[PDB]
Every structure is written in C-alpha cells, then in structure tokens.
C-alpha cells in the first residue's frame, strides 16, 4: 500500500521559566521511529524503532543537530509571534509544525506538505505544488515575505521531492519485517438491548496494521450511515490498532443489517451477522 514520512513538532512557551517545552516525533506511516524531548536528559534524537537503531553516529549527530535547530527556531518564533499579535508575556502559547512526504504503492513520490500553526490554528502552509505559500492572516502574510525572500519553499521542495522520499524508501526497506506487514483485523460482533425492543450491535476490528480501515453497517444492503455510531481508530498500545462501529436496531429486524469490513490485510472484505 501507500506510505508516508512525517515530522511533527510542538513548542509550548512557559511564561515564567525560560525555555519552551519542545517535542519532536518522526513517523513512517503509523509507526513512530524517532523522538526528541527537551525535558529528557540525553538532549539527543533517540530511536523508537529497532530498524533505525542500526544507523551510525553520523546519522544521530545530524539528526540531533537539525532537531536542535528546529527547537531554536520555534523558540524565537514564540517571541516573534507574541509581538505580531501583541500578546502579553504572561500567557502560554503553542507553535506546531508538520511536514513530510507520501509515496504510492510503487514508492513513487505522490505529494509533499509543510504547515505551521500558532495556538492550534493554521498560520501558514506550503501549497500543493510546493512553490507558493498560503498565509492565514496578516501576521502570516509578513512571514510569507520573509520566507519568499529566503527561498524556504525552494529548500523544502528539494527536501520533500528527493531527500524525504529517498530516506523513506531506506526506512521502508531496513524495517520491512514491520513497516511492510499487513495484519488483518481479528473481527467479531457483540449484541446488547437497552430495554427489550431496540438493540445495539457493535462490530469490532482488532489487532490490525496498517491503521487505515473501513467499518460500516448497511441496511438491506443499502448504505445506512446516519443511525450509526463510530469511534476514532485508537492504538492498541503495541503497534496495532482498534476500531468499532455500532448501530441501534429494533429487536427482530437485525438480519437486514450487516457489518461491512475492508482492509489491506484481508484477502476479501468481511461480512458479519448475529
């Protein structure tokens, strides 16, 4: 299936005690593989997956170097942004940055992205073609000019279209046992009637990987997705994922409601009944 590499950065100002909190994490698909936390003692980029632990010191020096510089940058942005919006220095504020790349089933570059948020809302983002910026408001607009002048978009595009994709493939290869697995959901159903004239059917998908999935109820084989109740895909805490969908059904009529399951790991889509 398709794959992606994504870096996620968060920096939270601490009004009274100096250094921001800064957390950086790298993902390949749904699997976290590196992290940096400015509160931990090593002050280095740390591994989080076995297939990255084979990379030599040059990698770890480079990755710590560049992740420090990301930190320093956000820490100066926190002050800048506070000026742009004229905020007092008594409040805590957040910058988040997210970038990375997607490849298809043939591991061919599909798209790049790079966006930046202030206090949990869009600030500025690289556009789809990766040559232009979209600015959220007036402040971002001034950041747009800075970054145009420094050819930040040109730097990112070269990064996202080459470097990003190239190392993603290396990661995909080095960790192929795990990153390239498909585990099918082990599925099942549970029934429950609140009183005794309507019933709740919950359809479970468990221990699957990768995390994308389709879990739906149909009525009479016709798509009924309004009387349904779904949860967000959660992590099982061991590298696989869980999801369930539920429906209310007037006791005695369940046979025309079935569960519909699609997933990379199944040779064919599953159906369910009680």
């Amino acid at each position: 299936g398709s794959h992606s590499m994504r870096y996620f950065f968060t920096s939270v100002s601490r009004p009274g005690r100096g250094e921001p909190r800064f957390i950086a994490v790298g993902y390949v698909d749904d699997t976290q593989f590196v992290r940096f936390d400015s509160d931990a003692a090593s002050q280095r980029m740390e591994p989080r997956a076995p297939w990255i632990e084979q990379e030599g010191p040059e990698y770890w020096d480079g990755e710590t170097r560049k992740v420090k510089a990301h930190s320093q940058t956000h820490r100066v942005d926190l002050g800048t942004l506070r000026g742009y919006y004229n905020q007092s220095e008594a409040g805590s504020h957040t910058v988040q940055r997210m970038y990375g790349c997607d490849v298809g089933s043939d591991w061919r570059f599909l798209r790049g992205y790079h966006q930046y948020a202030y206090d949990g809302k869009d600030y500025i983002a690289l556009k789809e073609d990766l040559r232009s910026w979209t600015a959220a408001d007036m402040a971002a607009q001034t950041t747009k000019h800075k970054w145009e002048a420094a050819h930040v978009a040109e730097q990112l595009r070269a990064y996202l279209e080459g470097t990003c994709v190239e190392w993603l493939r290396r990661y995909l290869e080095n960790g192929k046992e795990t990153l390239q697995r498909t585990d099918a959901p082990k599925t099942h159903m549970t029934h429950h009637a609140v009183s005794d004239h309507e019933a709740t059917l919950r359809c479970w998908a468990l221990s699957f990987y990768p995390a994308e999935i389709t879990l739906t109820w149909q009525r009479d084989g016709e798509d009924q997705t309004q009387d349904t109740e779904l949860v967000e895909t959660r992590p099982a805490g061991d590298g696989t994922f869980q999801k369930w969908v539920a429906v209310v059904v007037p006791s005695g009529q369940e046979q025309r409601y079935t569960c519909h399951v699609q997933h990379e790991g199944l040779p064919k889509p599953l159906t369910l009944r009680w």
Binding site: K66, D77, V152
Partner: peptide, 10 residues
Amino acid sequence: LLFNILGGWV
C-alpha cells in the same frame, strides 16, 4: 531524515 532548517524564522 529531518529537513536541514536554516534561518527559517517566521
């Protein structure tokens, strides 16, 4: 691999 960010302040 992280982006080599240099002078990318807002």
